[PDB]
Structure 1
Amino acid sequence: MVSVSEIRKAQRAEGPATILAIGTANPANCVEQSTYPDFYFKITNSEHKTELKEKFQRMCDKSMIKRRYMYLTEEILKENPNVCEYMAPSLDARQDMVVVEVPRLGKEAAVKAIKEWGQPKSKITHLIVCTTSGVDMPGADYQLTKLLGLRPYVKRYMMYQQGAFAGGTVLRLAKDLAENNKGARVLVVCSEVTAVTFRGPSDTHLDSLVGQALFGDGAAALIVGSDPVPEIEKPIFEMVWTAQTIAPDSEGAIDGHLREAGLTFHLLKDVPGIVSKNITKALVEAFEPLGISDYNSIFWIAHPGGPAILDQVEQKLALKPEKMNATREVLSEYGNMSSACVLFILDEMRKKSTQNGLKTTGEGLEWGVLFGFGPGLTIETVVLRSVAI
C-alpha cells in the first residue's frame, strides 16, 4: 500500500546546506603570550629548568599568537598540582572541569548563533556537538539540549575525542543532515577546553611542550540548513562538496591518548611538511571539477595548527600573503582552539568582508575552501560558496 518512493521524495530537502548564523564564545581569562613563558614555568614549578624555559620562550615567540582565553586560571592550577605536573593521575579532576565547561561555553556560543538566526529554537531539528575535551554519558549534546531548552526530540550527533580536524567533520556531517531532510535546521557546536591537555614541561617530551605554547579555549556555533526562507533567513556561506583523507607517510604524526593523567599528545613526523606536501592533491580533487586551478582566486580558511603549517602552505602554493589574513587573525587573538578554530575563521572572514564593504562574505570572491587538519594525519576539505553582500 504505502509508497516509499513518495515518502522519500517528500522527506528530503532541495538546495545546498547553508550556514545561516555563526556565534562564538571564550572563557573570560585572557592570557597574554608575551608573559606566558614566565607564568607557565612558575605555575608548574619548573623555574630550575633553564634550558627548557628558553626553548619554550622561543616556541612562544614564534607562535604568532598574541593572546589566548583559558578556563584554567592561576587559582584553579594552584588547587590542582597533579594537573601542573607533566604526568600525574588527574583525569578525574580534568573531567570534572570539562564535563561542565564544554557545554557551558558551547551554550554561550549557541545563544549568540540562535539570536543572529532569529528563528524559534523549537525549529532546531538536529544538534551536532563536537569536543576533544572530556567525555561523559549522557554527553555534552544532552547537556546542551537541556541548557538551551531545545526540543527533547532534537536528533543528536555527539562527536567526542575527535581532534583538530573536526571543524571540517562537523560541516561535512551537517551538510548531509540538512540536505537530506526537508525543513531540517542543524545547530552545530564545537567547544574546546585545554584543561584536559594542560600539563607541566618535560625536556624529553618537547612535542607535548609545543602544544602548551599553542592551545587555547573557545567555542563556536552555527545554524545550518537547506532551503533558507528568503529574507527571513540570511545565508552566509553555502557548502557544495566535502572530502576527508589520510595523508600517506603520516603514521603517528599526531597521536593523542586519553589516560589517567589526561590527554597527552605525541608528535612523530613533520606536520607542516605533510600538510604542505598533500594540500595540492586535496585542492585538485575539490576544484578540478569546478574548473578552477588558481588558488589565489578562492577564499581560504585553514586550521592554524601552528604558524609553520600556514607558512609552508603559503610558500608551497604561492598564496598571496593576504589569503591567510583571517586565519592568522584568529590564531593571533585566540591561539589554536582545536575543532572550533575553523568556525571562528569563518566568522572573522564574513565580519571583515561585510564591515569593509566587499561584495561577498568570502572576501569579495565566489568560491572558497576550508581545511581541517589533525590526527591520522587527517585532512578535511569543505568547498564553500560565498553569498552576495
Structure 2
Amino acid sequence: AQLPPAPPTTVAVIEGLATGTPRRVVNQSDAADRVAELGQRERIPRVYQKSRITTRRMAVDPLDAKFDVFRREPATIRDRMHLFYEHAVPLAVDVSKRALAGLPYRAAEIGLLVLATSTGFIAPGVDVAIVKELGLSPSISRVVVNFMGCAAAMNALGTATNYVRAHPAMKALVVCIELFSVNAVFADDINDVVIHSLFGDGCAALVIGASQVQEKLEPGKVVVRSSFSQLLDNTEDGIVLGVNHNGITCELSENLPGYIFSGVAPVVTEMLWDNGLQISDIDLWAIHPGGPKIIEQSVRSLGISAELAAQSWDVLARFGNMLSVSLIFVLETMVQQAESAKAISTGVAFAFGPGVTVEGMLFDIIRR
C-alpha cells in the first residue's frame, strides 16, 4: 500500500482583502495632453482616446520638471529600483495592515508572505519591510514572485493556497505591488506609447486561511474552489517583459488580443467542466482589466453579455492597468456589491502572463 497519501480536505479562503494606490490622480485626458507635448504628435491623442481609461494613480509624476530630466538619461535603472522600493514600502505596508485589521489573527499565526511584482527588484525589499513594519515573525516564510506579469496574483494566491492547506492552522499574506510610474521613459515606438498609456500604480493584499467545507463561512468571505493554468501554444511573443538601462519594460504583440480570443474559451470551458459547470452557470467574471482589447476579446471568447464584464471595465476606467494588482481590485468590487440575490455567487477569475499563460480560478462569494 504505497498509494499517494490522502490529500488535505480543506479549502483556501480569502478572509481579508485590501487595496490601495498612491495618492496622485492622473486624469487620462490631461495625461494625453502632457505627453502629446513631447512633427506629428497626433499619434498621442489617438492611442489615448482609445485606452478607455479615465484616471490612474501614480507614485511618481514622470513628466514632472524634476523627473523629466532624469527620465531622459541612460543607465538610471538602479535608481528607479531604489525609487521603487522608496514608494512601495509605505503603500505595501499600509495595504497589508488594512487587510489584517478585520481579522483577529495574531502575528504568530501568519506563516507565509508572498510578494509579487514585475516593476521592482531590490536586495532586501518590500517583503522584508512588511515583516518588520507589521511586526510579523522573524521566522515567517517568504516567497518573492517576479516577472510573472499581469497574472502574478494568481500564481501568488496559489502558493498561499498550498501552504494553507498543508498547514491548516497557519495563515498567509499575499501582497502584490506594482509601480510602473517609477519606470516611465516615454519612447517613440507605439508599444512604448501604448504601455505608458495603460499602466497605473497600485497595491493589494489578501489574507488566506484553510477551512473545512462543513464550516459556515460568513458573508463577504471568498472561497477558492479551483485554480488553473494554460501555456497558450505558439504564443510566446504575446507578452514580453524585460529590463532596460532606463527601466523595466513590457512588450505586447499585435496578436495578444487574438491569442486571448482563441485561448480563453477553451481553457475556461475545460476547467468549468471539471467542476460540473458551464459558462452559463457563472455569476461573476473577474476578467483582468489589462486594457480594452483584452476585456473586449475576453468577453467575445466566452460568448457572454458585455454587461457581465462591468466590474472589469470599471477598474480599467478608474485605475487603468496596474498589472497583477488589478485582478484583486476587480474582486474587491464583487465582494462589496452583489450581482444577484442568490446566497453564494460563483465566479471565474483569470489573467494573462508571459509565455501567454492563462492563470485563473473558480471561486464562491458567500452572500449570506
Q: TM-score, normalised by structure 2?
A: 0.91
Task: Select 2:335's aligned residue among 350, 353, 358.
Answer: 350
Q: Which moved more, 1:243-252 or 1:60-69?
A: 243-252
Q: Does 1:207 align with 2:191?
A: yes
Residue identity opposite 1:180 in structure 2: A
**Deviation per CA, 1:197-243, whole angstroms, max 9, x where unpaired?**
311230xx211211111100100111111027978976611112212
Question: Which structure 2 residues correspond to residues 332-347 of structure 1 after superposition, within 5 A?
Answer: 332-347=317-332
Q: Which moved more, 1:221-230 or 1:311-320?
A: 221-230
Question: Which structure 2 residues correspond to residues 88-103 of structure 1 after superposition, within 5 A?
Answer: 88-103=74-89
**Deviation per CA, 1:278-318, whole angstroms, max 9, x where unpaired?**
11121122111122223463411111111111112222332
- Which residue does 1:223 correspond to in 2? 207
Q: Does 1:62 align with 2:50?
A: yes
- Which residue does 1:267 correspond to in 2? 252
Q: Distance in 2 between matches of 1:286 and 1:88?
A: 46
Residue identity opposite 1:345 in structure 2: V
- Which residue does 2:66 correspond to in 1? 79
- Which residue does 1:38 correspond to in 2? 33
Task: Select 1:147's aligned residue among 133, 136, 160.
Answer: 133
TM-fit CA distance, 1:82: 5.4
Q: Which moved more, 1:110-119 or 1:326-335?
A: 110-119
Q: Does 1:18 align with 2:13?
A: yes
Whether the aligned pair in 2 keeps the contact of 1:65 and 1:332 (CA below 8 Å) is yes
Structure 2 stretches lacking a partner, 5+ long: none
Whether the aligned pair in 2 keeps the contact of 1:72 and 1:195 (CA below 8 Å) is yes
- Which residue does 1:241 correspond to in 2? 226
Whether the aligned pair in 1 keeps the contact of 2:185 and 2:246 (CA below 8 Å) is no
Q: Distance in 1 between matches of 2:297 and 2:253?
A: 18
TM-fit CA distance, 1:108: 1.3
Whether the aligned pair in 2 keeps the contact of 1:90 and 1:260 (CA below 8 Å) is yes
- Which residue does 2:153 correspond to in 1? 167
Q: Distance in 2 between matches of 1:140 and 1:333?
A: 25
- Which residue does 1:377 correspond to in 2? 356
Residue identity opposite 2:89 in structure 1: P
Q: Distance in 2 between matches of 1:89 and 1:245?
A: 36
Q: Distance in 1 between matches of 2:8 and 2:232?
A: 33
Percentage identity across paired residues of the two chains: 25
SS of residue paired to 1:201: coil
The 1:316/1:235 distance shift into structure 2, 3 A limit, reads closer
Residue identity opposite 1:383 in structure 2: L
**Deviation per CA, 1:332-375, whole angstroms, max 9, x where unpaired?**
1111000000011110111122xx88444xxx63x211101122
- Which residue does 2:119 correspond to in 1? 133
Task: Select 2:168's aligned residue among 157, 177, 182.
Answer: 182
Structure 1 stretches lacking a partner, 5+ long: 1-7
Whether the aligned pair in 2 keeps the contact of 1:68 and 1:216 (CA below 8 Å) is yes
SS of residue paired to 1:165: helix
TM-fit CA distance, 1:170: 1.2
Q: Distance in 2 between matches of 1:112 and 1:161?
A: 26
Whether the aligned pair in 2 keeps the contact of 1:186 and 1:224 (CA below 8 Å) is yes
Residue identity opposite 1:208 in structure 2: D
TM-fit CA distance, 1:136: 1.5
